[PDB]
Amino acid sequence: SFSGYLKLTDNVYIKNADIVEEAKKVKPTVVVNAANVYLKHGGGVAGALNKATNNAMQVESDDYIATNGPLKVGGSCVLSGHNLAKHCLHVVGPNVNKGEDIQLLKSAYENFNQHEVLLAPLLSAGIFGADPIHSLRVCVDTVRTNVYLAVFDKNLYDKLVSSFL
Numbered sequence: 001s002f003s004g005y006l007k008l009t010d011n012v013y014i015k016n017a018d019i020v021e022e023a024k025k026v027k028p029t030v031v032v033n034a035a036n037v038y039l040k041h042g043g044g045v046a047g048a049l050n051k052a053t054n055n056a057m058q059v060e061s062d063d064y065i066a067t068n069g070p071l072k073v074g075g076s077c078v079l080s081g082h083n084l085a086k087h088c089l090h091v092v093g094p095n096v097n098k099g100e101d102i103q104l105l106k107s108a109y110e111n112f113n114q115h116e117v118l119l120a121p122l123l124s125a126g127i128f129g130a131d132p133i134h135s136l137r138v139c140v141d142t143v144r145t146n147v148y149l150a151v152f153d154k155n156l157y158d159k160l161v162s163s164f165l
């Protein structure tokens, strides 16, 4: 199962790891993607997960959007996990750089509650522009299922652990 994680709460765990390498190693039931409403996996976690699938995630995602239209900010969809996981839960956190409501971050984390265990990044962190400390706080106060957070940046990981209330 998951190894090397620091336990933050009863159900939240955290590790300084590349989520792509972590997914290839564990092959979890669910890997969370930091998706946008269009499922255009260009950069950040989405670009990295998509590149690891040899673009199969993007091909599947374009068919999903052609059939269903865009997701809502705060929403999600379950697609294949390809070579990384059984499923990928594409979750749209608000992008502060796009002027999206940070209050939608709790709605985005609520999607995790539909899955017993997930490998995930911090929603709205990185290129989405939100404060990762705030994202971790919303995660622990919203997610009740078992979440294993992978934080790519060592310096941010140390700051998140050392400042965790």
Ligand SMILES: CC(C)NC(=O)N(C)[C@H]1CCS(=O)(=O)C1
Residues within 6 Å of the ligand: 113, 114, 115, 116, 144, 145
């Ligand atoms: C069976 C899965 C989808 N749901 C799940 O594990 N739940 C969300 C439980 C975790 C604690 S609770 O929120 O009280 C009920």
